[PDB]
Amino acid sequence: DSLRPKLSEEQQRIIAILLDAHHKTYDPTYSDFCQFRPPVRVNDGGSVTLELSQLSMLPHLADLVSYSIQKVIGFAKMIPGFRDLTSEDQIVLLKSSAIEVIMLRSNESFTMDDMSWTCGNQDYKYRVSDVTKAGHSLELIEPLIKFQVGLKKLNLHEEEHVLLMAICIVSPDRPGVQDAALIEAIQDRLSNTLQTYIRCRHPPPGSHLLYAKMIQKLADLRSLNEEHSKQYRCLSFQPECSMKLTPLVLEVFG
Ligand SMILES: C[C@H](CCCC(C)(C)O)[C@H]1CC[C@@H]2/C(=C\C=C3C[C@@H](O)C[C@H](O)C3)CCC[C@@]21C
Numbered sequence: 050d051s052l053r054p055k056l057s058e059e060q061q062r063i064i065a066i067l068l069d070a071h072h073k074t075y076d077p078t079y080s081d082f083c084q085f086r087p088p089v090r091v092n093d094g095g096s097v098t099l100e101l102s103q104l105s106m107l108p109h110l111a112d113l114v115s116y117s118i119q120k121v122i123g124f125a126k127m128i129p130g131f132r133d134l135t136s137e138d139q140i141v142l143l144k145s146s147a148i149e150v151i152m153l154r155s156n157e158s159f160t161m162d163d164m165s166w167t168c169g170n171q172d173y174k175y176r177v178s179d180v181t182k183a184g185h186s187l188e189l190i191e192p193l194i195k196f197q198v199g200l201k202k203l204n205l206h207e208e209e210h211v212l213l214m215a216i217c218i219v220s221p222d223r224p225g226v227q228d229a230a231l232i233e234a235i236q237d238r239l240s241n242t243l244q245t246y247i248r249c250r251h252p253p254p255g256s257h258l259l260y261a262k263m264i265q266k267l268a269d270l271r272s273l274n275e276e277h278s279k280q281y282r283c284l285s286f287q288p289e290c291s292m293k294l295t296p297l298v299l300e301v302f303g
Contacts (some may be wrong), residue, residue, distance in 0.1 A: 053248050060242040063129050067211040070127035074120040084111035088172050093182065106182040107284075110175075115295035117151045121218075124150075128215045132145040132233035138227050145223045147301050148191040148277050149270040152193065153214055159197040166197075184284045188293065189276045196269055203262060206250065212243040213263055219271060278302075 056064075086108035093099045122143055125131050131139065158166040166175040180190045205213070216239050221232040248257045281302045285291055291299060 054241070054245055056245050056249050057222065060245060063239070063242050064208050064246065066127060066129055067215055068207060070124050071077075071207070071211045071214075073127075073284065074124045075157065075290060077157065079158070079173055081116065082113070082168055082173050085109055085116065088179075089183065090179065093178075097186070100182055101184055101287055103182065104184050104284075104287060104290070104293055107184060107290075110179070110183045111294045111298050113289050114151060115297045117154065118147050118297055118301055120196065121147055121150045121154070124214065125218050128219060128235075128239075130231075130238065131219065133235070135227065138232065141225045141227075142218055142220065142223055142232070145225075145274075145299055146218045146220065149217055149274050150197065150214055152270060152273060153200070153210075153217060153266075154195055156200045156210070159201060161198065161201055164194055164198070184287065185280050189280050192269075192273060192276065195265070196273060199269075200266060203266075204290070205263075208246055208250070209243065209259075209263065212239055213266070215239045216243065217267055 088109040089105040091103065091104075093103075125139070125143055134142070149188055155166055158168045160167050164177070168174065177190055177194065180193075181187075216236060219232055219235045219238060219239065221229040223232075226232055243263070244257070244260050247260050251257075251259060253259065
């Protein structure tokens, strides 16, 4: 059997639209980052109390996340079909997917040279110790780095990378969606574009089985999101935490 259908004119269009959507909303130069409140890295050596006391990298990482949520919304608006949903569902989907899409999309600055996100030079190079200094614990960070490496190693084409983001976002099992059929319809259209792409275009050899691995990463993103939730709740109990966040971050993770 081994059937290999040609991508349809429409599928191609979808891929074009998504590549362009991404390039419009992902500055590979990180040129805006000098506009965020400053990275502050005063050493905890090995401490939760200090890290909560200071939260030194929270202003900087929360501006980075607030900014990225903005670009995500932007990206989501150009996904073919997104606009056909009601704004009520559009927002439900943006809200519940934001943290996951940031994680996926942060794969583009992630480097296996030293397991960091290099945005970068020194000041915009983010390591595990920076994430701890923004008040997160190892139970989110370590599965996150593992997630970044797993994803890197999939060596996705940009096409697969932007399809995966679109699919993560337009998900019919988000708690609180109204019109699940429509969202599924939009997702199936992307998944099918992705499944076909992989068979049409992906080396590697012998596998259309990369599709399976991609879906596994979506499941992974679910767990990281739950863990992020619980660590965000905790963060939010630090007095004056709200000042170190932004309106958009509070509303999206509230
Ligand atoms: C868990 C957190 C986020 C949540 C932090 C709060 C809100 C306090 O809970 C991490 C996810 C990955 C991210 C990192 C980079 C991300 C990039 C850099 C660029 O790729 C451009 C992307 O759009 C975005 C590394 C540092 C840690 C992070 C911020």
